[PDB]
Design a protein around this ligand. Structure first.
Ligand code: HEM
Length: 153
């Protein structure tokens, strides 16, 4: 359970992401894909991208980054009352896209990285800890729905 203080740190930094959702979305997906190449293989859409330059030139990758961050933003702004928003996301990522929970850990790390790079004055250690807790809560609750469906492993 995050506290109200910790939610405020999280959503203070997130409001700054909302000024440039596409740029953030691109940097995070590129970092995920470079740090953890296995994750790119889950996207038939992107698996032709062999260089960081080709990834940064891809409009379709930048489109997907906005889709991911708008959905994450929607869940963060529920401050933990996010069951309606997580159900479909867990359902599709377990059963259709086949994404292990650990790759959700990876993209959490890439999101923390990108926010520290772009918003260092709003993303000190308090706010880093709080964002980590929010992202853990997202992963806990998706993992519980994986388990229900037979995909926690
Ligand atoms: C913050 C974590 C994430 C969020 C909020 C998220 C959000 C989304 C949304 C909103 C969609 C499209 C709607 C849907 O299919 O449910 C999507 C599609 C997809 N996601 Fe995620 N995603 C996350 C993490 C990941 C990770 C870690 C992977 C892969 C490693 C991944 C792989 C996919 C794939 C393969 C699609 C289908 C893309 C396509 O071919 O159109 N997701 N995601």
């Amino acid at each position: 359970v995050l506290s109200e203080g910790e939610w405020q740190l999280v959503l203070h930094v997130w409001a700054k992401v909302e000024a440039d959702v596409a740029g953030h979305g691109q940097d995070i997906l590129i970092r995920l894909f470079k740090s953890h190449p296995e994750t790119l293989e889950k996207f038939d859409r992107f698996k032709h991208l062999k260089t960081e330059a080709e990834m940064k030139a891809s409009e379709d990758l930048k489109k997907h980054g906005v889709t991911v961050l708008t959905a994450l933003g929607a869940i963060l702004k529920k401050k933990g009352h996010h069951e309606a928003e997580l159900k479909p996301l867990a359902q599709s990522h377990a059963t259709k896209h086949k994404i292990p929970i650990k790759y959700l850990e990876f993209i959490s790390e890439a999101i923390i990285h990108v926010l520290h790079s772009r918003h260092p004055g709003d993303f000190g250690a308090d706010a880093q800890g709080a964002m980590n807790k929010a992202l853990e809560l997202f992963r806990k609750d998706i993992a519980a729905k994986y388990k229900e469906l037979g995909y926690q492993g």
